[model samples]
Target: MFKAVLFDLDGVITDTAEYHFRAWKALAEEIGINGVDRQFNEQLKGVSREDSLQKILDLADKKVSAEEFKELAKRKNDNYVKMIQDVSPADVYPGILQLLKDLRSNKIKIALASASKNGPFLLERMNLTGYFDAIADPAEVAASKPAPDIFIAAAHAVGVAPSESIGLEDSQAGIQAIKDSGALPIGVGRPEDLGDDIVIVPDTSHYTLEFLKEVWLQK
Candidate 1:
């Protein structure tokens, strides 16, 4: 049986992905890059700001010096922080709260494994900081998703074996990270969009404890 549930903050626990897209798009436009729209931003999912800038540079066939890169990353984060300031308890997905509550009551630990350095801040802003027993340390995010270190550290934080936990994610990188951590990957998005390689679940208002228990433990 699973002893913990790990969540990727952006799309799995909150819709901050949208704000991220908006922030990135704004940065792209300001940087004078064309065709760096939402679809292209998909490549940025579950990746760090530094990684995202590299993606943009590759697409635009451009280059930036180290100082410039650092500045750009900071500017994008500033933009993101401004937008996410309005995030509130109302921003959380309705069903997710109940699911977290049930897991807590049942003594199943919960943790967050996010590539974003802003993970803790976002959770605090959304008023969901208390629900999770652990959050991946931003300093440990030297390597992004698909590296597995982030997920492994998150499991360690909650005192659970990664192989004995379930992880929810909405991005391919996150799914890969969960697999690398040895956790069962549950994708949160359309089946086709999230891909057929994982156990994908649709977004809904009723992803309750009953559903999770049946899906996670019933084989």
Candidate 2:
């Protein structure tokens, strides 16, 4: 059985993908990238802003100095923060609030492992800061997704063992992180994005407590 439920931010807990896409697109446009599309945006999921910018630049066939890259990343974050400032409790996905309450009711630890550097602040803006026992801070991690450090840190923060945790993500990189963390990986997006090793859910709106207990949990 699982003792902790770890979630990704943009796709799992809230619908901030659009906000993220807008920010990225704005940054791309400012850099004279006109062909950036949703397909490219998908590559940004579960990737750090720094890495995301690198990929975006690759897509645009452009390059910048270290200082310029750093500055652009900061500017993109500034835009992202401004756009997400209006998020509220209503922005939380349908089944997520219920699931969070249910997990707390069962005394299970809840943590959020997000690629977003603003994960904590985003939750606060959504009035959901109190739901999680741990929120992984990018500043505390030595590596990003596709590496297990973030998820492992999240489990450690909640005093849970690797196998005692379940991680829900919407990106392949995040799924890889969960798998590498020695936790169950539940994908909340397209099957192609998660593939065979992950259990796919359309979204957290379907991740009811009943599903967690009757299907996902093994008591």
Candidate 3:
């Protein structure tokens, strides 16, 4: 029913959330912010590096110079990049490969709307780059989710209108962005985590062409 499908990378496509958590935790410790845990990492989901760092700073009530903030962000990304270097097709989430294939067979365009600047690299690492028609560059977006900019950009890149697309997201911010962009928000997390208004699947495994079509019809 939709012309395109927009995806958020981390938890939606694969489990890169763990790598991000580890990288952020490592950076937090290096900066003397102790006791970082998954609960804390949850707040970092679907957020940009700069925003994530600022959130960590807010948590500790600490501040850094602009240059220092840039350095810290770069350092965290460096660590993250190293960790994900071993990422292969095995890293893709359950049912995702088949779903991508199904989307292709059905001739529905696929696009990525991730906040991470490393979206294309990660897709290449997973060997799933060719499945995507376009990838929205976070650098070109004016604001991050819960702003619709990235999702809107992705839809535009694929020559589809945002309202004519379906978006899969695993974070509250991402879900909000999809909704705000006028797409049907299919969340890949628990209802409580994603917001009650969203149509949610527990994870990527539950998403199928039939399932998506059913959901689209209901919407």
Candidate 4:
């Protein structure tokens, strides 16, 4: 049975995908890059800002100095932060509150594992900071998703063995990280794009705690 749940913050918790898309699109435009498709957002779903920016730069055939990239990333983050300022508790995914309540009531530990350094503030803005026992952001790890370091760090922080924990993610990189970390993986969005060990759900709307209890907790 899983003793803890580690959640990825972006598409899994808040609907921040659109904001990320907008920021990346804007940044690409600023750099005179013409082909920053929305699909690029999918590619960046669980990647670190530095890595994502580098990828975009590479795609555009443009190279920015480290300071320049940092400045651009900060600008994009500013835009994203302003865009999410009005998000309310109601903006949370349907059934998320109920799911968290059920999990907490069952004495299951919950941890937030995110590639974004801004995850803590975003969670607080959504009033979701109280739900997790620990928060692990990419800033705390040497490498980001698909590397397994972040998920493993989060599991360690929550005092749970990797095999005894489950990770909920919405992206392929995040799913791979969980798998590599030896945790059960629950894919919330594009599951087919992820590895085979992932358990794909339609969305967070249907991922109730009772389902987890009945399935993952039965062992």
Candidate 5:
């Protein structure tokens, strides 16, 4: 049984993928890179800003200095932040709040593990500030997802071993990170996208407090 739950923020807690896609698309275009595609976006998910940007540069066969890459990354983040200004808490996935409440009621410590440095701002915008006991984002760690560093950091911060935690994630990289971290990974997306040790769910709408209690809490 799990004593703690570590959640990924972007696609798992909020629908910020569109914002990311838009920002990256704009950045790519400005850099003379081809337009963003689903494959590219998917590949970028759960990756660090520098790595994802570098990948894009590689894909485009374009070379930029490290300082230039940093500038571009900062610009992309600025654009994304502006794009998300209109988002409201109500825009969050259905049942997310209820699930957090339920987890709290069940005495399950909640920690947020994301590759995004904007995790806190995003959570606050979604009115989920008090839901987590701790948060570990890429900015807080030496490495990002698919490496288990961020999730492992979250587990350690919460004083829980990885095995005692259940990880909820929406991207392949995040799922891989959770698995590598030795946590039970719950894939909160289409079934086909999930990997081993992942519990596939159709969407957050189908997630219920009772269901989590029975499956995760009761063990």
Candidate 6:
């Protein structure tokens, strides 16, 4: 039996993919880096802000002073924060509300293991802040997704062992993190997109307590 359910913010709770793309694309253009498309933006999914900037810099094969790099990252985040100011409950993914309610009613702890520092803000904006028992802070983790740090922190926050928790993710890196943390990984997108060797749900609409219990038993 699972004691908790950990979730990634952007794609799992809501669709902030394009908002991030627009912000990063704008920054890339200002920095003269070309071809920052959705395909490229996909790499940033579940990635830390600093790492995302590093990827952009790598794409341009450019280097910047520490101060400049910090400034650039801040710029991107500010823009992203601004863009999501209009977020509302309507922006939440279909069936997410019902899933959250089901989890809560079933006494399942809910924790957020998002890589985004804006995780709290997005949750608040979408009016889903109350759903989470704990929101793992990215800055508090030793490392971001693919490292198991965030997921570990999330489970710890909820007083649940990682092995007894289920993690829902929409990015490959997020799934890897969940697996590395000893939790069941449920990819929220197409299996091909997230990779093999992991269980996957087609979308948030399919995420329910009944479905989760079946997967947990298989694990």
User: Top model by lDDT, which number?
Assistant: 3
TM-score of each prediction? 0.82, 0.84, 0.87, 0.81, 0.81, 0.85
Candidate 5, residue 25: lDDT? 86
Task: List runs of model 4 lying over 4 Å from the truth.
Answer: 28-70, 217-219
Note the clash tally of each candidate: 0, 0, 0, 0, 0, 0
Off by over 4 Å in 3: 28-33, 43-70
lDDT for each residue of candidate 6 in 1-219, tens digit (9 for 90 to 100): 999999998789887888988999999999899978999987886567899999999987999999999899999988888888888898989888999999999999999998777889889988888889999998888876789999999999999999999999987778889999998998888977888788888878889899999998887
Q: Which RMSD values do the candidates have, in order?
A: 2.9, 2.7, 2.6, 3.0, 3.0, 2.7
The per-residue C-alpha lDDT of model 4 at residue 185 equals 84
TM-score of 1: 0.82
Candidate 6 residues lying further than 4 Å off, grouped into runs, are 28-34, 39-70
Clashing pairs in 5: none
Report the Cα lDDT for residue 19, model 4: 77
What tens-digit string does per-residue lDDT give for candidate 3 at 1-219? 899999998888887888889999999989998757999886887566788999998878998998999999999989998888988999999999999999999999999998877889899989999899999999889998889999999999999999999999988788889999999999987987777887899878999999999999998
- Estimate the TM-score for candidate 5: 0.81
Better of 3 and 6 by TM-score: 3
TM-score of 6: 0.85
Which one wins by lDDT: 1 or 6?
6
- Show the lowest summed lDDT stretch of 10 residues, model 3: 40-49
Pairs that clash in candidate 1: none
Of the two candidates 3 and 6, the one with more favorable lDDT, higher being better, is 3
lDDT of each: 0.82, 0.84, 0.90, 0.80, 0.82, 0.89
Clash pairs, candidate 2, are none
Evaluate residue 107 in candidate 5 and report its C-alpha lDDT on the 0 to 100 scale.
84
lDDT of 3 at 68: 93
Better of 4 and 5 by lDDT: 5
Off by over 4 Å in 2: 30-33, 43-70, 217-219
lDDT of 1 by residue, 55-74 (tens): 88787898899998998898
